[PDB]
Each structure stands twice: as C-alpha cells, then as structure tokens.
Scaffold this active site. Structure first.
Site, PDB file in Angstrom:
ATOM      1  N   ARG A  32       0.836  -1.191   0.000  1.00  0.00           N
ATOM      2  CA  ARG A  32       0.000   0.000   0.000  1.00  0.00           C
ATOM      3  C   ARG A  32       0.874   1.246   0.000  1.00  0.00           C
ATOM      4  O   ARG A  32       1.786   1.381   0.823  1.00  0.00           O
ATOM      5  CB  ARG A  32      -0.926   0.026   1.215  1.00  0.00           C
ATOM      6  CG  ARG A  32      -1.687   1.340   1.426  1.00  0.00           C
ATOM      7  CD  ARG A  32      -2.736   1.185   2.528  1.00  0.00           C
ATOM      8  NE  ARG A  32      -3.473   2.406   2.838  1.00  0.00           N
ATOM      9  CZ  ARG A  32      -3.188   3.231   3.837  1.00  0.00           C
ATOM     10  NH1 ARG A  32      -2.191   2.990   4.677  1.00  0.00           N
ATOM     11  NH2 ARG A  32      -3.935   4.317   4.009  1.00  0.00           N
ATOM     12  N   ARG A  73     -11.697  19.706   7.730  1.00  0.00           N
ATOM     13  CA  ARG A  73     -10.759  19.939   8.811  1.00  0.00           C
ATOM     14  C   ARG A  73     -10.987  21.326   9.383  1.00  0.00           C
ATOM     15  O   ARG A  73     -11.394  22.251   8.669  1.00  0.00           O
ATOM     16  CB  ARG A  73      -9.302  19.790   8.315  1.00  0.00           C
ATOM     17  CG  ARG A  73      -9.034  18.459   7.605  1.00  0.00           C
ATOM     18  CD  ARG A  73      -7.550  18.183   7.415  1.00  0.00           C
ATOM     19  NE  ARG A  73      -6.882  17.880   8.676  1.00  0.00           N
ATOM     20  CZ  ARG A  73      -6.856  16.681   9.241  1.00  0.00           C
ATOM     21  NH1 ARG A  73      -7.472  15.645   8.698  1.00  0.00           N
ATOM     22  NH2 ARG A  73      -6.201  16.517  10.384  1.00  0.00           N
ATOM     23  N   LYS A 220     -13.447   2.507  -0.088  1.00  0.00           N
ATOM     24  CA  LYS A 220     -13.311   2.567   1.363  1.00  0.00           C
ATOM     25  C   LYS A 220     -14.620   3.071   1.965  1.00  0.00           C
ATOM     26  O   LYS A 220     -15.047   4.197   1.691  1.00  0.00           O
ATOM     27  CB  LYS A 220     -12.134   3.464   1.748  1.00  0.00           C
ATOM     28  CG  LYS A 220     -10.814   2.964   1.200  1.00  0.00           C
ATOM     29  CD  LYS A 220      -9.692   3.981   1.325  1.00  0.00           C
ATOM     30  CE  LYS A 220      -9.301   4.268   2.763  1.00  0.00           C
ATOM     31  NZ  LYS A 220      -8.185   5.261   2.790  1.00  0.00           N
ATOM     32  N   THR A 278      -7.264  -0.802   9.409  1.00  0.00           N
ATOM     33  CA  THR A 278      -7.143   0.140  10.522  1.00  0.00           C
ATOM     34  C   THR A 278      -7.229  -0.564  11.870  1.00  0.00           C
ATOM     35  O   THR A 278      -7.956  -1.554  12.019  1.00  0.00           O
ATOM     36  CB  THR A 278      -8.181   1.272  10.484  1.00  0.00           C
ATOM     37  OG1 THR A 278      -9.457   0.788  10.915  1.00  0.00           O
ATOM     38  CG2 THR A 278      -8.273   1.874   9.096  1.00  0.00           C
TER      39      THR A 278
END
Lengths: 465, 465, 464, 464
Positions: A32, A73, A220, A278
């Site tokens: 990855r 963000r 994802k 994760t």
C-alpha cells in the site's frame, strides 16, 4: 501455508529492496502506498524497488494506491496555541477560511459546512475527541454547544455522524494522484470516503481517461452514508476496504462489528475482494509484540472471511515492521487452518460449476484447484466457497496475475498461452507438480471456460498427477 | 430483551442500595465480590445491600465470590525504590524471603521457585513487563538473563509460561474466605488459578466441610497447565471462567482466541455455565464510552456462545460504572438478537427430549419454553441449543433460582410446589401469562421430569395459552 | 418419450421387415432371438430383416441372442397323453431316452440324473406343478414318492432345488449357437440358467475364441443356485436378466419379489444393464389387451429401476404382437414420467457423473451429452436416473447398438471426436439436430479428457 | 410380528367358532360380512360366533359390514344359457324386469337406465367384458351397437363410465342392512360404490339416526366418478377401500396402479385407515398356494403403505381359507420387516407425534404407548410408519376394536386413566405385561394433557 493475504503500508523504514524482500518472506503480499504522505518521486522509487525485488527473486506482489480523499478539517488558531473547550460552552465554526481561531470560534475547510448540517446534529472534532451539538446555523456560521471538555489543536479532522456530506468524490490532489497511478500501472486504487455509487463512477471515469481502465477500484467505506449505499457501491466497485476506525467515529459503537461482518459476507457472495483495515496491530508501532485483544480481533476478522488484512503505521514507520508482518502471518496461518469450506436467485452456470468443483475437490481430497482465468473472475468464483484446496490460477494477463495476489488462497501464475481445454489440462498438471503444492498421485480439479466468451466458467475436470 | 447475563464486580462506588438498584435496572444479573480486596464486614454489607434491593423490588440476582488465590510475587526493594533492569544483564531470584532486592536480585514469595523451574524456562515479571531466561539454578537462587529493558517495582506478579507450578490449590486466606462464603450462603465460588482436577476437588471438599455443598464452583483457567487439563477440570466443576488477560501472559498470543472459543464450546456441550472475563470494557474506568475494539470483542465473545460477560474495575471503582453496564447491555441485546438456535456418543434421554423440545418450539414459533427443575440441570440442557424462546425455569429450590440467573436466556421463578405433571402444566401456563413474556394464543413448550429421579428430563408438552 | 427400453422376442408373425418396422415404431428397441425354433438360415434372415429396416429407416436397434444352458427335461408319454400322478404313489425317472412314459415312470434328457441326485432330494416337474422326493437310486433309475396330485404332460422342465447339476454352462450341443452369434455380430448373448461365476467365464472364453470379445453377456437368473451366487455372477457379467417366473419355481413365493428388487438395485449400482422378463403381458398371447394385474406388475418393475422389460410369446407367437408392444410402451411412458433422479453417490467417474446429473437438474438441462467408447460413461450417468435424456456419442458401432438397451439413452454413431473442445462443438450440433434440445437450452457434456477409456473425468455446461 | 392387518370375508366354510379361532391364530384381524348372502339370522350368528371366540380366548378383532350401493346389473337369459354377441350387431337393454334375455336384448335392474343414458354413451357389461355404444333410446329401451365380441351370461354388472347414475347412495332396499349394523354394534361400515361426498354424508346421517354415530365409514372406490371425487370422499369418510378390480373396469389400464398408490398415500397423510381389496389371492379359491404374480402384487401394496389387505372369496367360499390367511400373513411379515419410518411432517398434533417417532427411533424404543379416546392419536403416530409397535390404551370399547384395522397398532381396553402421571404408570405396566417390551427397554408415551379429545400434545420417555 496461510491463505489470508497481507497488505503492508510501505514507508521510509521499509522501502529499501533489502527490507521489502524480508517483508515478502515474512508474508507481505501487497504494497500500500498511502498518498496522504510523500511525493511522486518517493512513491515512484518505492514502486521500482518492489518491482526490482520481484524480478530478482521471482516473487509476486501487487501495488495498491490509497488516496488521501476529501475531508473536513478545522484550521489555524491564535499563535498556533491549543485552546481548552469546556462542556456546555458555546462554540462556533465558520466557513470563512481567513479566520484565525480561538476558544470561541475556528474556521473549517469545507464551504458546505453550513448547508449540510442541521440544528440538532452532532459535530465531532479530532477523531471524536470533542463532541458538539449544533444549536443554530446563521450565514457562514454553525453555532454549537460543546458536549465534553477537550483541547482543540490546529488542523483537526471533523466527523459529522449520520450526515450526507456534499464533498466531491475526489479532492483536486486525488485527481492528480490517480493520473500518477495510471502512469505507474498500479494494480489497485483504494478510493477514500466513498459515500454513494456516483462517487465510484467518477473514479472509474477518471481512471479510464488516463489508460487505467484495467485498474481495480477498492471503495473505502467510512461512514453511515456509505453503509446505507453499500449494495450499489459494491456493485460498481471491484472490492471493498472496511475502515473500522472511521466507522467507530461515525456510527453507534455496537453496530461497527456487524457492519464489518456484513460487508465481508456481501463481498464474498459478490465474488469481489475485501480488505479489512485500521486498528489491526497498532500497538506494534511502539512494541515488539501485539496485544491479546489485537490478535483476537485479527483472528475473528479472518474467521469473518476477509480476503486480506492491512498494516498501516506498523509496517510503514513503526519500530517493529518485520515483527508486525511475522506475527500477522502467524495469526493468519493459525486461523486459516481451522476454517472450513462453505458449500452453500436463479442459478447461474458459473456458480453451479465452481461450487460443484469445490465439492468435488473436497470429496476427493484434492490439494489443488487449477483455474484458467483472463480477468480473475473464475478464480474469485472458486474462492467464494472457501475451498480447503489452494487455487492455482493460470492467466496470460499480467495485471490479473498481480491482482489475484490479493484474493484469499490464490496462487497466481503467469503463462505464455493456453490454446485449448486439453492444453489447459496438460499445462496445468505440469505446473501443479512444478509448484510443489501437489505431488504424483494427487487429485487436482481443473476449472475453465470452454467455447464461451471470457467471463463465464463452465467446465470442471478431475486429473491425477 | 437480552439473553446474555452480566456479572458486575461491586466495589465502593457501586455498593449502595441506590446504585445496585440502578445497576440491576441497567442489566446487571450477578454481583462479583473480588476477594483480592476488602474485609469481611465490607463484603457482608455489600451482600446485605443487594439482598435488600432484591426483597424490596422483587428483582433477582446471584452472588459470586471470587477468590484471590495463590500467587508468586516478587518482594521488597532497597529504599522502596524502583530499579532499572537492562536487556542482557544477569538477574537472580532468591526464595529467601528476608532478602531486600536491588538491580541484581529480588526475593520471591514462593519457596518452590527453584524446584519448579528449569534452565531455559521463561520468567515474566509484572504482567509480562519484563521477560527473563533461566540460565542456572543453584541452592535458593534462580539465575537469569534479562531479555528486555524495564523498571522493576516492589511486590510484582510473576508468571512462568508453560510451567507446572506446585502452589497449593488454595492460599490460607482463601480457605477462610470460603468459610465466609458458606456463612453468607453465596451462590457461586470462582476459584482462581485452577490447574488440575485435584485443585477443584480440594475446593469442593472445603465447601462441603462448612455446609456449602450446594454452592457451585466456577474454575478460573489462567495458564497452560489449566488448559492442558481443561476436560478434567470442567468435569469436576460446575462452570468455567475464561481469564483472557492471564492467558495472554501465559500462552502464545495467537492461541488465546482459540482457547476462549474452545472452552466456551465445551462448557456449552457439557451443560455447564461459562463466564468470559477480564479486558472487557476496561477503557471505561476512565472514559464514558468504550472503544470500537472493546465492543467488537464483547460481541464476538457472545457470538462464541458465552453465558455471561464480566465487568471488573469498570463496575467496581471506575468513573462510569452505570454507563459501562448500560453499553454492555446494549451490546448484549444487539448481538443476542441475531443469534440462531444450534440444533445439533450414544444418545441420552435428557438430550433427546430437550433438543426435540427446542426443535418443536422453533417449528411452532413458541416464545417460551417452561422448564420444571430442582438443581437447574433441565434448564441448562435446554439452553445448550440456544433456543430463540426464553426459558422460564420454575423451581422450588431457592439456591437454584439464584444460580440460574447466570445461565443464558433463563428467567428463573421460585414456586411453592409442583405436585404432578398436570399441575406443572396448569401452573406453568399461569406463570407464562403472568410473566408478560407470552400472551393468549401463544404456544409454549413445557419440559419436565415425570416418574423419574431428579436429574433426568424426559417429558415435553405443547400448550396454547 | 419413454426411457425404459423394450426387448421383443421375434417369431413367425413378427419377422417380416414390415412387421419389424411397425414394432420399432411402437416402441421396440431390442430384438431377442430364442434359439429353440428354426434353423440357422431362419435366424440369419431374421437378423437381416431387422438390419434392412434399420438402414432403410435410419432407426437403431440391438440384437440379443439367447444361448442355451444346462436344463433337464422329461420326455414322451404313451400316445402323447397326459397322465395323472397321485400324492403318495411311487414314480420313477429313467435316463434311458428310449423309454416312453406313463403314470409310473418317464425318461429325462440328462444322463447324470442318477449321479447328481441323492436320496431325500426334491424333484420338481413342470415349473413346480408336481413335486417328488427321491427314495432310492438304482442303475439308471431315480425312484421317488410323489408329494402332490397333478397331471404330467410331455417334455416338461425339471428343477432340482439344492442340487448342483453337473452339466457345463455351454454344452457342445449348444456352442454352435454362440459361434453363429459371433459370425452374425450380435450385440448381446443372454445365457440361460447361469448358476455361478464360472459359467459366465466359460461363455466369455467361448466368445473370445470366435471374435466375439466385444459382445456383452446378459446372465439369466432362473434358479436358486444362480440367486445364491448372484453377486459373483453380476461381477463377471455385463448385465442380468431377471427371469422371475423360472426363479419362482425353486424359492419361497414371498421371496421372489424381493429377489427381483434386490437384483435390479445391485445392477443399477454396478452400472450394468438389467432386463426384467417372463410373465410380463402373457395374457395378450390370446387377448387384445392385458389385465390390470399385469399392467401393475410391469409398472412396479419399472419403478424398481429396470433398464428394460421383455416380451416373450406376446411378440413371438401371439395373436396381438403390435398391441402388446404398444400398451407396453404406454405403460413405460406413464411410469417413467413420474420417476425422479437418485442423487446419492470416492471414485472420479462416480463423482463426476453424479455431479453432472445434479448440475443438469439444478439448471433444468433437457440433455446430458456423453462421449463414450465402450459405453461406460453413458451407463455411469444413467445410474442416477437423470430426468434429462442421455445423448451418447460414440465412434464404436457395437457400443452404439448396445446402448440401445440402457434406460434413457439415445446412442449416436459419429465419425470421430478429436479433442474435448471438438466434442463440445460436435455435441451441441447433434443436440440441436436430434430435436431433444433447442436453442437457449442448457446441456451438460460429460467425457474423458487425457485419460484412457473407462474413466469419465470432465463435465462442461453449454447453452445451445 | 406383522404390522399390516388382514380383513377376512367370512362365509359358510369359515363361520364356525372353530374356524374363526384358527383364522385369528393365522393372522386375521377383521371380519368382513358381505350382506349379499344369507338373512339377518345368519349374519347375527356369525357376529356372535366371533364374539364368543373373542371372549373365550381374549383375542381382539373388528367387525366390518358392507352396505350396498347404487349398482346396475343385467338379468336372466333364455334357459340360463350364455349368448354370443358380435362386434357391430344391434343389442337392446330394457328396463322391463319381466323380460328374459337372448342374443338380441336383455333386462337391467334399474328403471332409470333410459333416463340417465344418452346417445353416444358407453355401456360396459360384466366388468368390461363387452362394451357397447348407445345409438337410440325409445320408451323403456336403450338400443346399442356392440363394440367387441363376447359371451353374455346372466346377472352381470353394468358400468356407465362418464354417466352420473341417479340412484341414491343407500336405497330403502339396502338401508335395513345398515340399521342391522347399528343394532349389532359393528365397528365399520364399508359403503359400496361411493361416487361423491354427498353419498358419504347420506350414510353418516343414516347411522346417526339409529345410534351408530360411533361407527366408522370406509368408502369403497370402485368407479371413475368416485376416483374423480376422491379428495372430498376421503375428507368426509373415516377410511377408504381401494377396490382395484372394480375401479379398473372404467379407467385406462395403465392408470389403475397409480390410482391405488395415490389413494393410499392421501389416506396415510389424512391419518385415515386404508384397505386394499379385490384380486388379492383369488387363485387360492381353488388352489392351495398363490401365484408369484399375486404374492408380488400383495407385497407392493404393502410397500405402498396400506393399513390392511382383504381376502374375499379366498376366505369366504374357497377351498383353502386357512392356507390363504397363512400365506397372506407370511407375505405381510416378510414385507413389513423391510419397511422404514417416514419422518417428514405446523399443527401441534403432527409436531408432537412426528417428534415422538423420531425420538423412539433415535433411542431404539420397541414401543410407543398412546392414550387415545377416539383413536386419533394412535393413527397420528402410525402415519410415520414407526419401527416400534403402537400400544394404544383406551377406555372406549368401540375405539379398541376399530384400532385393530390400523397398521402396527395393538389396542388395549383399560378401565380408566385419571392423569398424565397415571398414564405413564399404567402404560409402563401394560408394556411389560404385553411382552412387547422388557425391563431396561425405552418406551415413548404419547397423550393429550389439559386439552380436549382430538389433540395430542405430550411425549414422554420412560425406561421399563
């Protein structure tokens, strides 16, 4: 040998040819590239180093490009200083990107913040550290009540549980990263923050415009909208990445385990590849051994049926990258070896033939199922039933040979040509013996398409080596 | 409603009647008294407070006494000061309990330390913080090489992976604690560090000598020796506690998950109660919500088939005891409701009848199986098949009524008498309706022993309410 | 269309090309020649008549030749007249073939009658009509006590339950029929009164000595000794004829039905063809329709799983041969259509063939196409009683004719099959040409790839 | 011991207490009285003879009385002599009962013959021996064309396929037999030529008017109309008699076997008793042993699942009644012992009874003990063909006799059953007393607890 495949995030500590060869030896199958970091020259030399190891050793691996993706963000604060927010206080977000923040207000990067939110919604800041409730929306301001004490730093992630966010499918930088992926001929693109089918189509169209039509898309799934639209996302994708950590910030905590199990099961049934990712062995960024809890989570993820498990910081930047891969491989082998075949809508020819082939292999103690495949479909159709036998997948397609590295229990092999069904049987028996995975006297079941267009599996044949 | 039962360790924060009533409302079923702490007066008032809540509210609960058990610990250090041990150094343990330790040597509490160990064995200190290898044994000294850096404090636990340790079954204090348990009439004793069948027999004999013959023994499996002897330990016990944390210190990390799954499955088959414990929601000692990882581990433990899950510090001393119970209950309900019956050695009458009763209940959409039981066996025999239906267990035995609180999916009810099979059917139909768990027109399956000695289930009967 | 195959014994009324064509139209699949009437020229002409019909019409059929076995018969009586024997009287058999019989003594055809029998043995005459007990043996005479009243006619069968008769399986008297069968290239030999495996081997060695190694042997089970030795007889044979009427002479009446059912089941499992014969539609020798009882027996025989049913006098000598074939075919069609597959199976052939039938059923395939050299793969698929018709492609002419006897098989002779892929191409073509399947239908195609004849290892699914 | 039950028609040779005791010993379970021979005094004495044997020996049996149905018959001919009818001739039926017949015309017993028939209908005479087509109807005459050659005798049955005959189910002529049955307290009435459900209801209303509400009705299916209406006939009846010979007169021959199999299967599923009858061992009317064909038909009828098989002339008028019963019992025992349970089932009764059989099988129970008032629970267990014998305890004397007809049931009359626990106590005792089970054996005990008669809801496992 293990059947579950290991995706390793490669970074500065692990990008040398010497380290990559040791990672492959320890059980790494897929590299990855996390494009939240690094520039094109760095990723390019990483790609070349892996390909050098592959050609020197004859080992095989795939390359997966993981996009950063779009995000919300917070921005900068007065003097660069953290501010302390207090349960019950008023706190305001503004979409004015010029504002410098303090203990009462901070700017966000997302112009649509006011549009997408509603009074009563929850806003979470910094990986769920600080929760807030929207009390009013006025102009370019989202006014909130803080729900718990916490320290706000600069440039923190924002999560909006249960909210359909109108961010684009791709950040502008993601669009250039995909072009790089096409230039480099990567095997997979993992697309971040996929929420709906149209997000996938946009990625597919961008790849097609730059010659990447044969690159497989792993979507994802990170939030409630993506889960709600999962069926259509899977239909449009080549595979799924289950992002447990993001899900735990975004949906009720007791649902995350069933979101994982459901997505894995649906991917299996659809004959599409699934990566679970994760919070796998994160403790090994600092420690030479994982925790009991982490090892149990990995094992249960394999028992769920995932094709592959993924290492992130543990393999890219942490102190014990080789140890992380090794213990991951150990867990994989120990767990894979106690799993059984699963031998269970109008019936299609491919599924009838592939299911029967696995049943025949099991009834005859066949150690190997040999499959002829162009795009990988027949290999994935056999893997759906979790055969005890290893799948030896013969293909003339170099991209397919690399992509099948990610599929559970598949050993791909590139061959020059396959001219007929009988030639397939002769060649497959030869390569079965050459592989060391089967020996004289062993039964192998051989699966292929005869007198049909690519994309249909219709023939199963039993041979003694 | 949930079927999985919750054991809560009760301590200073949670021992008041007010708090216990809220814990019961939130899903607590069993109080654990951890006798590693507190004196008899404190545990006695805890017991009385729970029993007061029970009689005032009519709610039911069980009381479990968890023994401290025997242990190997290091002892004191010069000036009470931590010492820093270095990878590769020599370090020596002595069984001379008068020695004060330093960076080269410390005493241990266990006289048999030199006898039980062998050159080449691993010694682990302080919950696995510091690992060492035995290089020589001489006199009262075990001389080691330290394997990793770490700080040694005073009075730390010592673990000897793979070693059969000749500690007694019971520490002297444990023996007095069991007498207290008999005096108080607790429902269960959880016996620590059970390694072999003779350990269980000693506990059984101690209870019998003080009138506790009806107290059920839950053996805590904590190391490799106990796992090796698991079958004989289970046969001699009334149930098992899976101590995951201790196991993770004592056996290879990749085996712990399968030790848990195996023990649960064998307990189920034996019709004996199993509690899964330690490292459940530990993050909630400090936090008002658990982690994704913890929630997934709890769910998978339930899917494994455990009767009960246990809270330790989270419910006894932590900041969020009620929140811990509540989210635990939420996870239980969410997980229990997606589980299915399991409707699979010469066949015994009890198993034939109980399995058939569950099959009949399922075929007829019966919401309730009503069982007449003296010691609890018939209720546990039905629960073995994980019925969708709730088990309403009628007993004249007060101890049994409390003990069945720990069994998955069982609602015990104490009744004055049951004079005949037909009386059982009349009474059971009445109490089925009174319970609110079934309504007019619902089918119930009613299971009992007719013209046979207690301990055999031989009759199944189908009634419409 | 029916799946059960019909064997017709051909006789005077039915041997013309005209009558044979009508019998084929009505459902006849196999011609049986019973080598007890007429000379070789007659038999040769019957064979030629069928082969002319076959080549003219393109229809296919098999030819089955009965070879004679070790039977014993009584002989002639005074004036040709029946005599009445009474329970308790003395009655004497003599091996002197010149003696003409009466109510006290008759001749038998077998010189070893005195040697093989013992005091106390039971002698049964005329399919058990009259039973007797041996009381003494003296010279060429076997002296008996009659056990029940009955009328003795001329030239009646003799049964010796519990006695092993010392005759060979094939007498020199009867070996010329088998040589004739080899000369004529018949497809099957049905061997009478097979008693034990060595009888089968004897027939096999005789065929191999005259160019008949590819002729299949159907062993006729007709007496207790053969039933006792059934398992070894089946192993050595290519198939079985269940001759229930003859078998019933020697065993308890309540056992005969289970002897039939057991033999059919073992034949099915062994992938060997089974014919059920005798007392099928005998009432139609004289009547234009059968009885309810007869139709029910036939149907239950089909439900038992027989490959084929056989007409004897009904088609050879009777007044209503065409009607007999027609109603038999009607019964076959009506019973076959309510039968289901039997999908219990390890060997590679069985795994592949059972799986092919399962796949065909799951995909509603009307046809399973099989490539076969000696017929084994076609018979291996038939074992599971597929709903689908079996289209069996072969380059072997003998195989093509022999598969005519197998339940639910349509054989087709093809010029050549050069590869697995060529088989799939050719098989799809012939499936469509056959009319047994149409465009869009699924067919499952079964064959051997890179293995010697005798192993079926490949199953492939195609859309026409 | 056998599980299939035997119904024997009792006639002159077999009505004495001595002969009845021997028939019971040989395997007879039910006496059938055919109310076409002898007067009421004869029938009453036959009933008394059986009941004397029962009370003397303690043996149990049931009594089945046949009630007559709407049949048509031809009548007398000149001199009592047969006549020859030829295909194509004209032949005339007349409703004038005084006419004596010849080769041109005969009388029929039914005045409505002219009304019910139409030009073009088929008339069949003597179980279909002679078929004719109606060409005209004039006055009291039905004028026909004969369709095939045959010999007409006196007093032959007449069948009118496709015609609904307007006679009632029970003529006033035939209602006295049923009243007699009620007076005598018979266990079953077998009603002839049931055509439709209203026929069954008519018989039921007649019984209820004369104190016979607890007598069970067995409907005889004998013609096409009844077969067409089978489902509604079964729903209204307590059981069925499959009269294959009579049924075969009117329907295609290849269908008769499946009509039998289908009716038996539906009866099994409905938990209603089924008797298979006609052409069972008829050859033993004259011969001391049956044919292979007959034995095979009987065995296949048992394998189909029939509760009972029935002897007619073989036991009533024939020369070998005891031999017929004995060989029938031998066939029953030999066939019953190779039959297996059928464990596919929702209703509470079916769930509990199917589960009880499964539990018995899993635990090798030799016996299932059932408490039953009207017999329903015993029949509900029998539906699954348990290997175990069913010991059925009842306080109802009529039920105890009626359960004699049900496959594999041993009824026992008991004084009382006061509770579920009392049933378990009493049942274990009687299981041991019966000799059907021994100390250490598992028995499964099935009953209704706290529910009305007609619901079985409890299964309990005990060690003797």
């Amino acid at each position: 040998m293990k059947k579950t495949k290991i995706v390793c995030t490669i970074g500065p500590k692990t990008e040398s040819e010497e380290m990559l060869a040791k990672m492959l030896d320890a059980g790494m199958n897929v590299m990855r590239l996390n494009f939240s970091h690094g520039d094109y020259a760095e990723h390019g030399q990483r790609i070349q180093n892996l390909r050098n190891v592959m050609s020197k050793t004859g080992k095989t691996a795939a390359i997966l490009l993981d996009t950063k993706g779009p995000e919300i963000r917070t921005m900068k604060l007065e003097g660069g200083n953290d501010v302390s927010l207090k349960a019950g206080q008023t706190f305001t977000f503004t979409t004015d990107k010029s504002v410098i923040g303090n203990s009462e207000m901070v700017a966000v990067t997302y112009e649509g913040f006011t549009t997408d939110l509603s009074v009563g919604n929850t806003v979470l800041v910094d990986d769920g550290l600080i929760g807030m409730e929207v009390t009013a929306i006025e102009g370019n301001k989202v006014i909130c009540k803080v729900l718990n004490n916490g320290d706000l730093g600069e440039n923190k992630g924002v999560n909006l549980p249960g909210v359909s966010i109108a961010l684009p499918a791709l950040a502008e930088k993601d669009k250039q990263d995909l072009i790089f992926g096409c230039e480099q001929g990567v095997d997979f693109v993992a697309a971040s923050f996929i929420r709906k089918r149209s997000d996938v189509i946009e990625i597919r169209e961008h790849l097609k415009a730059h010659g990447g039509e044969n690159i497989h898309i792993i979507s994802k799934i990170e939030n409630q909208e993506g889960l709600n639209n999962f069926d259509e996302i899977l239909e449009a994708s080549d595979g799924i990445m289950v992002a447990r950590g993001d899900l735990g910030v975004e949906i009720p905590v007791e649902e995350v385990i069933f979101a994982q199990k459901m997505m894995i099961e649906k991917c299996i049934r659809a004959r599409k590849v699934v990566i679970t990712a994760t919070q796998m062995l994160d403790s090994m960024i600092k420690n030479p051994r994982p925790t009991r809890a982490e090892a149990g989570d990995v094992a249960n993820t394999i028992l769920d049926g995932t094709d592959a498990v993924m290492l992130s910081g543990e393999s890219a930047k942490g102190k014990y990258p080789l140890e992380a891969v090794s213990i991951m491989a150990t867990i994989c082998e120990r767990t894979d070896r106690v799993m059984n075949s699963r031998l269970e809508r109008k019936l299609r020819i491919t599924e009838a033939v592939c299911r029967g082939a696995v049943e025949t292999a099991e009834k005859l103690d066949a150690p190997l199922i040999v499959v002829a495949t162009q795009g990988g479909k027949s290999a994935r159709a056999v893997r759906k039933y979790f055969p005890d036998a290893t799948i030896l997948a013969l293909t003339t397609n170099e991209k397919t040979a690399h992509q099948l590295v990610l599929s559970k229990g598949v050993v791909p092999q590139l061959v020059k040509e396959i001219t007929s069904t009988d030639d397939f049987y002769r060649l497959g028996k030869e390569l079965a013996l050459q592989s060391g995975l089967a020996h004289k006297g062993d039964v192998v079941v051989m699966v292929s398409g005869a007198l049909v267009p690519s994309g249909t599996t219709n023939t199963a044949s039993v041979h003694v080596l």
